[PDB]
Amino acid sequence: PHYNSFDGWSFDFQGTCNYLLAGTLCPGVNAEGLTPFTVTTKNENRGSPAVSYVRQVTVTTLNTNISIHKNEIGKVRVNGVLMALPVYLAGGRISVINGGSKAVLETDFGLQVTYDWNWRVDVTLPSSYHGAVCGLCGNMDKNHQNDQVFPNGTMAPSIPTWGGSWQVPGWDPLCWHECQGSCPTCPEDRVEEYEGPGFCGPLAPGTGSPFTSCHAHVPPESFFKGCVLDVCLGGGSKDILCQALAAYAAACQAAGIKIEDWRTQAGCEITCPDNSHYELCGPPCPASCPPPARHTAPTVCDGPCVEGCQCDEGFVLSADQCVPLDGGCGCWVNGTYYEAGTEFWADTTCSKRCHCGPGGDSLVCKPASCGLGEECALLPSGEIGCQPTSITECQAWGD
Amino acid sequence: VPNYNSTCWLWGD
Amino acid sequence: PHYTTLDGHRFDFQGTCEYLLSAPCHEPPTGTEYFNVTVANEHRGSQAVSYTRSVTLQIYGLSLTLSAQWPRKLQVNGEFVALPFHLDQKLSVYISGADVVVNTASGVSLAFDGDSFVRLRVPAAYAGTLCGLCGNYNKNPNDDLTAVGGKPEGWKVGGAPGCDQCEPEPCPKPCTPEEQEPFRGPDACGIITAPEGPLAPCHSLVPPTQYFEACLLDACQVQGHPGGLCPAIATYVAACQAAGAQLGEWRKPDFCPLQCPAHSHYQLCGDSCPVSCPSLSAPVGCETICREGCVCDAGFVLSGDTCVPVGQCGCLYQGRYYVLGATFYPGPECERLCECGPDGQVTCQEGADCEPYEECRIENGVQACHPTGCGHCLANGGLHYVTLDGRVYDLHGSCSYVLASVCHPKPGDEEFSIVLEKNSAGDPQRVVVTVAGQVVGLARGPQVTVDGEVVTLPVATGHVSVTAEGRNIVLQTNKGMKVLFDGDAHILMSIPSSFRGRLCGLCGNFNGNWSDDFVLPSGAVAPNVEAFGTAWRAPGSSLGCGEGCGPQGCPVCLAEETQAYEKNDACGKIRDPHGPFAACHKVLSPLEYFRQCVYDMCAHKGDKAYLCRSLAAYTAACQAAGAAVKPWRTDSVCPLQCPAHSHYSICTRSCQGSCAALSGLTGCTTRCFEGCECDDHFLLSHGVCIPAQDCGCVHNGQYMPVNSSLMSSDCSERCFCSPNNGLTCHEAGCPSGHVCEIQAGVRECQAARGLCSISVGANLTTFDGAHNAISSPGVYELSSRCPGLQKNVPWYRVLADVQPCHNNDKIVSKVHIFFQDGLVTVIPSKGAWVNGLRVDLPATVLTSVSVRRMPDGSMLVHQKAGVTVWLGKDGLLDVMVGDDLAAMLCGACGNFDGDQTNDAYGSQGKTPIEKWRAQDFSPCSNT
Amino acid sequence: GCPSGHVCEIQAGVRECQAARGLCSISVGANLTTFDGAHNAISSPGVYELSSRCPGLQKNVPWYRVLADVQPCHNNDKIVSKVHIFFQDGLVTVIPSKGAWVNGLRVDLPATVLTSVSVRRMPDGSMLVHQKAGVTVWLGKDGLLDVMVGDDLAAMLCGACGNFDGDQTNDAYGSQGKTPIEKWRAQDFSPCSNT
Numbered sequence A: 001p002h003y004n005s006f007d008g009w010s011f012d013f014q015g016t017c018n019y020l021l022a023g024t025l026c027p028g029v030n031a032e033g034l035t036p037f038t039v040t041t042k043n044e045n046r047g048s049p050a051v052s053y054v055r056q057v058t059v060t061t062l063n064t065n066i067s068i069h070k071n072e073i074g075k076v077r078v079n080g081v082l083m084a085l086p087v088y089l090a091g092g093r094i095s096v097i098n099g100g101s102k103a104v105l106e107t108d109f110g111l112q113v114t115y116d117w118n119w120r121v122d123v124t125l126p127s128s129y130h131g132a133v134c135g136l137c138g139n140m141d142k143n144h145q146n147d148q149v150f151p152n153g154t155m156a157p158s159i160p161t162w163g164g165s166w167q168v169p170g171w172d173p174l175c176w177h178e179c180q181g182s183c184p185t186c187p188e189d190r191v192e193e194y195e196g197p198g199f200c201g202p203l204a205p206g207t208g209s210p211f212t213s214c215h216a217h218v219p220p221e222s223f224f225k226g227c228v229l230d231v232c233l234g235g236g237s238k239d240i241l242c243q244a245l246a247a248y249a250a251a252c253q254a255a256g257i258k259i260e261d262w263r264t265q266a267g268c269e270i271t272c273p274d275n276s277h278y279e280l281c282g283p284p285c286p287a288s289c290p291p292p293a294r295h296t297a298p299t300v301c302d303g304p305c306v307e308g309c310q311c312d313e314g315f316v317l318s319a320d321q322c323v324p325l326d327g328g329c330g331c332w333v334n335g336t337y338y339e340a341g342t343e344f345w346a347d348t349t350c351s352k353r354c355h356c357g358p359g360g361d362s363l364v365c366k367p368a369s370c371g372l373g374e375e376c377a378l379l380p381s382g383e384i385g386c387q388p389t390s391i392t393e394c395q396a397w398g399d
Numbered sequence B: 001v002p003n004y005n006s007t008c009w010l011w012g013d
Numbered sequence C: 001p002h003y004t005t006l007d008g009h010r011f012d013f014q015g016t017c018e019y020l021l022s023a024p025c026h027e028p029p030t031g032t033e034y035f036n037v038t039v040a041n042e043h044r045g046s047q048a049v050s051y052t053r054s055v056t057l058q059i060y061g062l063s064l065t066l067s068a069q070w071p072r073k074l075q076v077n078g079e080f081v082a083l084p085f086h087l088d089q090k091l092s093v094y095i096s097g098a099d100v101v102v103n104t105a106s107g108v109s110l111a112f113d114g115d116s117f118v119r120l121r122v123p124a125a126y127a128g129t130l131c132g133l134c135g136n137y138n139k140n141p142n143d144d145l146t147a148v149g150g151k152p153e154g155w156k157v158g159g160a161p162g163c164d165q166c167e168p169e170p171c172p173k174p175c176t177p178e179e180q181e182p183f184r185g186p187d188a189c190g191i192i193t194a195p196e197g198p199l200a201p202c203h204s205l206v207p208p209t210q211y212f213e214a215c216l217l218d219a220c221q222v223q224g225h226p227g228g229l230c231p232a233i234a235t236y237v238a239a240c241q242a243a244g245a246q247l248g249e250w251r252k253p254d255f256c257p258l259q260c261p262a263h264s265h266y267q268l269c270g271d272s273c274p275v276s277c278p279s280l281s282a283p284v285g286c287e288t289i290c291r292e293g294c295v296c297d298a299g300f301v302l303s304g305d306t307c308v309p310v311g312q313c314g315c316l317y318q319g320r321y322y323v324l325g326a327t328f329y330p331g332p333e334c335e336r337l338c339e340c341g342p343d344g345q346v347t348c349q350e351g352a353d354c355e356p357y358e359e360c361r362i363e364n365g366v367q368a369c370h371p372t373g374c375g376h377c378l379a380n381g382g383l384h385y386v387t388l389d390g391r392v393y394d395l396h397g398s399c400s401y402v403l404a405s406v407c408h409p410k411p412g413d414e415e416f417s418i419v420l421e422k423n424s425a426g427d428p429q430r431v432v433v434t435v436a437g438q439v440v441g442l443a444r445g446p447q448v449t450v451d452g453e454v455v456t457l458p459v460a461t462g463h464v465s466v467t468a469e470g471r472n473i474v475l476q477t478n479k480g481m482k483v484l485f486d487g488d489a490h491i492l493m494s495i496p497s498s499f500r501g502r503l504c505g506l507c508g509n510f511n512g513n514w515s516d517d518f519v520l521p522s523g524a525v526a527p528n529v530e531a532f533g534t535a536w537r538a539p540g541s542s543l544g545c546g547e548g549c550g551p552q553g554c555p556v557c558l559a560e561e562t563q564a565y566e567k568n569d570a571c572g573k574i575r576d577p578h579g580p581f582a583a584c585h586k587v588l589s590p591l592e593y594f595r596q597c598v599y600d601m602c603a604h605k606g607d608k609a610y611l612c613r614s615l616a617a618y619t620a621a622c623q624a625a626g627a628a629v630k631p632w633r634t635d636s637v638c639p640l641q642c643p644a645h646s647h648y649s650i651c652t653r654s655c656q657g658s659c660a661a662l663s664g665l666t667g668c669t670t671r672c673f674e675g676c677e678c679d680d681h682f683l684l685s686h687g688v689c690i691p692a693q694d695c696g697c698v699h700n701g702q703y704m705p706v707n708s709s710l711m712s713s714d715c716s717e718r719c720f721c722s723p724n725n726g727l728t729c730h731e732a733g734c735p736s737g738h739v740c741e742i743q744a745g746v747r748e749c750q751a752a753r754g755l756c757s758i759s760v761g762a763n764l765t766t767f768d769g770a771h772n773a774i775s776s777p778g779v780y781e782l783s784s785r786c787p788g789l790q791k792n793v794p795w796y797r798v799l800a801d802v803q804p805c806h807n808n809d810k811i812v813s814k815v816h817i818f819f820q821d822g823l824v825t826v827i828p829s830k831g832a833w834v835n836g837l838r839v840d841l842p843a844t845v846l847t848s849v850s851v852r853r854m855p856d857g858s859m860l861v862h863q864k865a866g867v868t869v870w871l872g873k874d875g876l877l878d879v880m881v882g883d884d885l886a887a888m889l890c891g892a893c894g895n896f897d898g899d900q901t902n903d904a905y906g907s908q909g910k911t912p913i914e915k916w917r918a919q920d921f922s923p924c925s926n927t
Numbered sequence D: 001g002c003p004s005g006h007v008c009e010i011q012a013g014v015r016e017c018q019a020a021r022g023l024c025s026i027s028v029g030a031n032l033t034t035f036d037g038a039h040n041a042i043s044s045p046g047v048y049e050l051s052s053r054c055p056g057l058q059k060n061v062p063w064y065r066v067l068a069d070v071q072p073c074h075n076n077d078k079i080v081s082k083v084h085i086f087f088q089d090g091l092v093t094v095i096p097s098k099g100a101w102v103n104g105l106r107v108d109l110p111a112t113v114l115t116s117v118s119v120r121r122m123p124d125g126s127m128l129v130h131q132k133a134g135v136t137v138w139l140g141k142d143g144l145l146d147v148m149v150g151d152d153l154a155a156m157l158c159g160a161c162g163n164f165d166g167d168q169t170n171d172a173y174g175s176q177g178k179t180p181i182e183k184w185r186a187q188d189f190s191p192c193s194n195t
C-alpha cells in the first residue's frame, strides 16, 4: 500500500505477508531505560495482484500482543478473544479506545497506534522510547535517506527486498514482494479520462475544489498519484475513490484545519445508521460509557476534529453503533467492555459462555463448553469457539 | 528533546 | 463408477438413475441439521458404465445443486444465482479452482468439480447415524453397504422413467472380468503407479494400488478414449493433493489436454480461494491445498464463471449477488423489472404484469412471464395440410405455401414462420423455419441435412437447438417451439407459444368453432378450396406452379376404393385398438390419420403414397408426447435397413451415445425416437457409426467428427482436431480476398461475388472489376446505396479514411462508416470510436458493425445482410458484398448488377472523387 | 438575433436577448473564453474538443460532446469550420454556407432534425442549432461561435471550457499537480499524423 513512516518518508512497497512495521530494538542493543516494543503489518489482496492492501496489523509490547484484522473491533487480546471499542486490560494502564472512524490504544507509556476498520493505518509513539526505531518506520532519525537498512544492520540497497528482510521470522509460502509473473499494469489512456471531476476530482489541488484550506497543512501530492493508480489498476468503481479521498480528508482535518462539505457534491455520502449525524467537523472520542467509568481519560481525547457520522446527538455511541442513553453501553467488568450481550467467550478454556447484560452493569454466564468432537481452540479472528477434532473425506470416485 | 513526538501512517492501497 | 468409502471400502457400480451419497439417518440431535446430498447418474459413452451428473445439497432450508451439465455454477432452490452466495453463519459456498466447495458452520463440507469426482468431508460428530452411500463413519470397510445389501445401486431418488433398463437387450457390453487390457502398459493409464515419473511424490504418500484398478476398466469400456483418460488421472491427483505433495506435471497434450472458458489457464498448484465479486477471500481455512485447475488472469470469478473483467462486479441487492445487466425480477410474482445498476445500486422500475394468459413462474433456471398455451399442426401428407384447429380442410396444393405467419408485430414476441415447400408433382415437402431473423432447415428428404446456414450441421446449437433424435429430427428455439420432419411429408408442429390472435394463415389462429373462420388480409368469404391456395403464395417460386390435377381424377379413384376396398385394410387393422402398432391413441386422436391412411392416394394403384410411405409417420411422430410403441415392423414387411454394425429398435435414445461430449438433446422429449442403434463400443455420428476410435472431439455447441475442420463465426481459423491429440482451436483471421459466407453450405471463408478492394497493395477493383485507385487523401464514399430504391441497403455511405499516416503511403489510417445510425470510426493504431467515444476493440454490433481484432492486429467490419470492410494491421482493405444486392447501390464502387459495363465505373465522371466523395468531413475548401 | 448569443431566455417576464450564465465563447477574435475568467489561443490545427458532459457525473443531462475544427477556413482565421456536435444519437454537423449534413444526408435548413434539436439558418446569414435543456451553437457567417449552456449545470462538465464554477485559474491547467490536456486533440477525427 501507501506508507508514511515515523521518519519523514513515504513509499509504496507491496507485500504478501507480515512485515516489521514499527518497534525500537530489533537487536536489543540499547539496554538502558529499556522498554522494547514491536509492531508488524500484513498485506492481502482482493482480486488484482497488481497491489496489496492492509489486512491484519500486529504489535507486541510488554509481554502483550495486539492485532486488528480489518473489521469492526477486536482480535487484539493475547488470549485470542476480540475486544470492544473501549477496553482496559488493567495491567500497566493499557486501554484500547477507538474513535468513531479510528482505533487507538494507550498504555502506562501511552502508546497510541490508530488503524481504521478498513485499510487506514497510523502509529504514534508514547514518547516513552523514541531513540531508535526497528521496523518499516526506519531509524526515524532526522535524515530520511538512511531509514532503509536490514534487521541485521547491513546497508540495504534493495528496498523491494526490505519487507522480506524485515518480514516475520519463519517461512511464508506464496509471499512475493513483487509480482513475479506478468503484472496487469493499468493503461496510460484511462488515467487522463478518470482523473477528471467526479473521480479523484476534489483530491486534486484547487481553490474552487472543497477543503482548499486543507491543502496548506497536508500535501495531497502523494494522495493524488495514489488515487489515479489505485482506480486505474482497479475496475473503476466509485468506492475506491471515496476511500482514497476520505484518507486525505481525515489526515488534513486531524492536522487541525476545519473542512467544508465535500460528500454531497462528489456524490459519495455515508448511509450511517440510527442517529447518524454526519458532520463536517465534530469532536473525537464520542460519548461512550467507559467500561471502568472511573479511570483516567486518554490523553488523545483532547484533539482536533475528525470527519465521521457522529451518533452522539440524542443517543450515545457504543458497541460500534448508536445505542440510546438507556441502552446497555457495555457490561463494565474488570475494565473490560462487553457489548449488547453478544454472548462472548471470556477465557480460552471454553467454559465461560458469558452473555452480557450491559445495562445491568454485570454479566450472566454459563459453564458449558463446545466438546462434541469440536475442541475450543481459538478461531481465526473470533471468540473462543468450536473447531472439529478430525474430519475425514469420502471420495466418490468417477471414471 | 521533548519536541519530536512523531507518527507513522499506512494508507490503504 | 468406482469409489472409496471414508471407511476405506472400495466398490464399484454403473447406473443411470439419481442416487444419494451422503445423508444423515435422522435429524441431528442439536446444533446441526440434515445435509442430505443426492447424486445423479447417466449412461454416457458406451453401455454398462456411468459418469456422475449432479449432486444436490439440502440444508438449512436451502437446496443447493451442482451439475456436470453446467460447469462452475450453482442452482439454488430451483433457480440460477451467483456462486459467491454468502449467507449468514452458513453456506459460504465458493469456487475453488476446478471445484466448488460448500462450507458450513457445521462440520459438513462438500467439494465438487463435476467431471467424475465428489468429496464430502463429514465431521467426527456425524458418526452415530450416517446413512449416505458413502457408508458409516465407523471407518470399518467390511461393515459398509450392509443394510442395503450387496447392491451398490439400491439407493435412488426419483429419476427418469427409463433409468432402470439400459435397452430391450440386456445392457450390451459388460466389461471384461479379466481386464484383458493391452493398455495396462505405462503408455496410457500407466502414470499413476509407475515410479520414477511425474507422480513420484504421492507414489510414497498415497498408496495407488487402491486407485489403479479403476484405470483399466476405462480401457475396457472404450479403447483409449481421451474422454476416459483425462478424468480418472485428475480424480486421483486431487485426492493425492489432499495430502500435500509437490506433484510433477501429469497433464500432457498428447496424453490429455484441457480447455477452459475465456481467459482461464491451467495450473497444477493454484490458489484454492480466489476472490469473488464481493472482494472477500473465503474466511474458511485457505491455501490448505494448491489445487490444479484453471485460474482467471487479470480477472476475478464473477458469479462463479466467465472470468469477468475487473471491477464490473454487479449488484448485491437482497444479499444474492446479481450480475451486471441482469433483469432480476427479484420481487415475487415478477412485480418489478429491477435492473442491475452500473455502480451496484439496484435500479428498480415498476414494470407491467405482462400478458394475462401468461404466467410468471420459475422454469429453465430463470423466472419471468412464460407462455402457457399449447397447439398442434399436423400437415401429414404431401399435398395434405391441416389448419390450426378443428376439421381437416385437406388442400391438394402443388406450390410453395406458408403454414403460419405473424400478422401483428409485438415487442415481446419474436420472428416465427414455418413454410412447407411441397417439392414438385405433389411429392413430400421439405421444411424451413424462420426465427430471430434467421432461417434454419429442420430436415430434408434424406435422414439429416439440417440447413441453417452451413448445410453441415449433424448436432449443432445456437439460438435454436436441433436434435437428430434417431429417425426423426426435432427443433426448439430459445423459446420452446417444437418442429419435426420425418424425412417424408409428415410434420408435427407443436406451438405452445401463446401468440394468440396475432397468428394467421393455413394454420391460422382464430380460436372458437370448428369453422375457424379464416380471414384474408382484405376479406375472406371462402370462394373455394383452390381460392385459399391461390391467396396464400410465398416468394421464391420458380415458375408459380399451378394447383390442381388436370381432370381432378386424383380423388375419384376413392370411388373405386368404395367399389372394392382398394385402400389400407391393414391400416384399418393397425390404427384400430386391436392394432398394437399404435398405443398413443389416448395421447392423440387417430381419426385424422385414419382417413389420411385411407385417402392418401389410390392406395393400391396409380400415384404411390404407400403403406411404407406414410404408415410410419403417425407411430414415429406420436413419440413427441410420451408414448410406448410396440414394434410396428413386427413382420418387418417394410424393412428399415441399417447402415452398418447396427440393429433396429422402436426405442432408440440416440440422445445418449452422441459422438460429442456436448448434448443439446432437448431432453429428446424425455423419450426415445425410432431408430437403428449401432452396437459394441458404437459411436453414432450423422448416420455413419464408428466403434469408439475417432469421436474424441467436442466443441461449445457443434459436434466435430474425426479430422473435422469446423470454422465458427468471425472466421478465426478453425477448431481442427485429431483423435490422438488436438482439439486445439487454431485462431487466425481469414486471409484477404475471402469472406465468412456459406458457400455451398460451408462456413469456410471464400471469395464473395462483391469484392471492391481498397488497400490490397493499394488496389481498388470495383465490385464489378474495373480497377482505379483512390490515389488521394480524405474520406471517400464507396459503398453508397443508390437513393430512393427501398431495398435492404441502408445509408451506410462508407467513407474510407485513406490517409498517409504510417509511412506516409496512404494506407487505411481510419475507417468512417455512417451506417445511418452513427459515425463508426476504428483505427488500426489506436482504438475503435463509436459516436465519438472510443470503446473496447473486440466489440461487435449485429445491427451496426462487426468490429473485432484479427490475431495480427487487423480489424474488420460487417453488417447482418450488409457490407463488409477489411483493415489490416498495416493498411489493408477489401469490401465484401453479396450479389443479392444486384446493382441498387451507387458509390465510388459501381452498382455490381453483375455487368462491368452498366456502371462503366463512372465513365463520364470519376466515381471516387468527381462523384461520391464526402465533403461533410472535408475542410471549408475556401482558403 | 443579437451579436452575442442570448435566445430563449424568459427574463423580466418575457423572452429577451439577455445573456445567460452558461457561456463559453470560443475563439471569438481567436481567444477562447471559458465559463470562467480565462483567455488563450489554441494555436493548434485539428479537432479539439471544447465541451462535453463530464464522464460519470450524476446529473441526467445527456451527453452533449462537441468538436470544433481548427481548420483556418476563411483567410486563416482558424474559426470553427464545422461544429460536429456528437449528440448521443449521432453526428448532427451543421455548415453555415452549405446545407446541414445531418447523419450524412443534406437536409433543409428550417426543419427540426434528429431528436429534441432545432436547427435553422439565421436570417442575417448565420446558423443556430439548439438542444432542449442542453447546449446551443450560434455559428456565425464569419465563424464567430459561442457555446451556450443553461445555468442549471455548475462544474458538471469537463472540457476545454472546463468547470462552470467561475474560478479563474482552477480550470486553466488546474492547480499544483494535474494532467489537463485542455487542448484534448481527440484522435477519432484527428489525423493520425504519425510521420
Ligand SMILES: *[C@@H]1O[C@H](CO)[C@@H](O)[C@H](O)[C@H]1NC(C)=O
Binding pocket: A150, A151, A152, A154, A165, A166
Ligand atoms: C541479514 O538480513 C536478512 C534478515 O535475516 C537475512 O536474510 C540476510 O541473510 C542477513 N544478511 C547478512 C549480511 O547477514
Ligand SMILES: *[C@@H]1O[C@H](CO)[C@@H](O)[C@H](O)[C@H]1NC(C)=O
Binding pocket: A110, A112, A124, A125, A126, A127, A299, A300, B003, B005, B006
Ligand atoms: C506528543 O504527545 C502526545 C502523545 O500522543 C500528543 O497528544 C501530543 O500532541 C504530541 N506532541 C505534540 C507537540 O503534538
Ligand SMILES: *[C@@H]1O[C@H](CO)[C@@H](O)[C@H](O)[C@H]1NC(C)=O
Binding pocket: C020, C023, C034, C036, C037, C058, C059, C157
Ligand atoms: C433432503 O432434504 C430436502 C429438504 O427438504 C428434502 O426435501 C429431501 O427429501 C431430502 N432427501 C432425502 C433423501 O431425505
Ligand SMILES: *[C@@H]1O[C@H](CO)[C@@H](O)[C@H](O)[C@H]1NC(C)=O
Binding pocket: C510, C511, C512, C513, C514, C515, C516, C517
Ligand atoms: C363461430 O361462428 C360465429 C357465427 O357467425 C362467428 O361469428 C364466429 O366468428 C365463429 N368463431 C370462430 C370460427 O372461431
Ligand SMILES: *[C@@H]1O[C@H](CO)[C@@H](O)[C@H](O)[C@H]1NC(C)=O
Binding pocket: C693, C694, C706, C707, C723
Ligand atoms: C484422421 O486422420 C487421417 C486423415 O485422413 C486419417 O488417415 C485417419 O484414419 C483419420 N482417423 C480415423 C480414425 O479414421
Ligand SMILES: *[C@@H]1O[C@H](CO)[C@@H](O)[C@H](O)[C@H]1NC(C)=O
Binding pocket: C737, C755, C757, C760, C763, C764, C765, C771
Ligand atoms: C488488385 O488487388 C485485388 C485484390 O483482390 C485483385 O483482385 C486485383 O486483381 C489486383 N489488381 C492488380 C492490377 O494487381
Ligand SMILES: *[C@@H]1O[C@H](CO)[C@@H](O)[C@H](O)[C@H]1NC(C)=O
Binding pocket: D028, D029, D030, D031, D039, D040
Ligand atoms: C482576447 O482576449 C482578451 C481577453 O478578454 C480580449 O481582448 C478578447 O476577449 C480577445 N480578443 C481580442 C481581439 O483581444
Ligand SMILES: [Ca+2]
Binding pocket: A007, A138, A139, A140, A141, A142, A143, A144, A145, A146, A147
Ligand atoms: Ca532516517
Ligand SMILES: [Ca+2]
Binding pocket: C007, C135, C136, C137, C138, C139, C140, C141, C142, C143, C144
Ligand atoms: Ca464402515
Ligand SMILES: [Ca+2]
Binding pocket: C768, C887, C894, C895, C896, C897, C898, C899, C900, C901, C902, C903, C904
Ligand atoms: Ca454493374
Ligand SMILES: [Ca+2]
Binding pocket: A208, D036, D163, D164, D165, D166, D167, D168, D169, D170, D171, D172
Ligand atoms: Ca473555474
